[PDB]
Amino acid sequence: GTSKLKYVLQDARFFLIKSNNHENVSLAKAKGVWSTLPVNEKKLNLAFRSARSVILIFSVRESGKFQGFARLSSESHHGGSPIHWVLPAGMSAKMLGGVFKIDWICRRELPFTKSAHLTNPWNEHKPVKIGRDGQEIELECGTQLCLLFPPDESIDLYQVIHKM
Numbered sequence: 001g002t003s004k005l006k007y008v009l010q011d012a013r014f015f016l017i018k019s020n021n022h023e024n025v026s027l028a029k030a031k032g033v034w035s036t037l038p039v040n041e042k043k044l045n046l047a048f049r050s051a052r053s054v055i056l057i058f059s060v061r062e063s064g065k066f067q068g069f070a071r072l073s074s075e076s077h078h079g080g081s082p083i084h085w086v087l088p089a090g091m092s093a094k095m096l097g098g099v100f101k102i103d104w105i106c107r108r109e110l111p112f113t114k115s116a117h118l119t120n121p122w123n124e125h126k127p128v129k130i131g132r133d134g135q136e137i138e139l140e141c142g143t144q145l146c147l148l149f150p151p152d153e154s155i156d157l158y159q160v161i162h163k164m
């Protein structure tokens with residue numbers, strides 16, 4: 001069903017995460033963490049304090065798909081265990097030092113071909129597949145994009161709801 005999902009998405013903020021590689025998205029699915037550059041680190045830290053849920057929607061570059069989406073459960077933190085990201089060319093581990101804890105809501109893929117009818121008012125009404133890392137997605141677009149994903153029966157939204 002979709003009722004607990006819709007409850008989680010009600011009045012959420014949505015952000016596009018564009019991973020350069022698959023390795024870090026698999027790590028993020030395994031460990032429930034994400035790290036971004038400080039400009040997006042600041043944006044997400046602000047959004048986490050402002051909304052009942054902040055949803056990150058992942059897509060790895062060149063894949064033609066989204067790989068799932070997750071909810072921020074914390075602000076970024078520095079000083080923990082060095083998460084072994086595959087660091088992109090031009091990105092240092094000090095830049096990715098901020099670590100967000102995330103709860104996955106769906107780890108299933110969605111091909112871009114299935115989101116062609118959805119455009120983002122905060123990105124000039126471009127198809128929602130188009131955007132740089134950190135691009136905020138408007139409420140209705142983001143909600144409808146999340147509802148397009150195949151349900152992930154492995155995930156129980158009860159624990160997620162217990163953090164809102």
Ligand SMILES: CNc1ncnc2ccccc12
Binds near residue numbers: 021034037086133
């Ligand atoms: C886990 N950190 C990352 N991994 C892969 N690509 C990225 C692109 C922009 C910012 C952060 C990235």
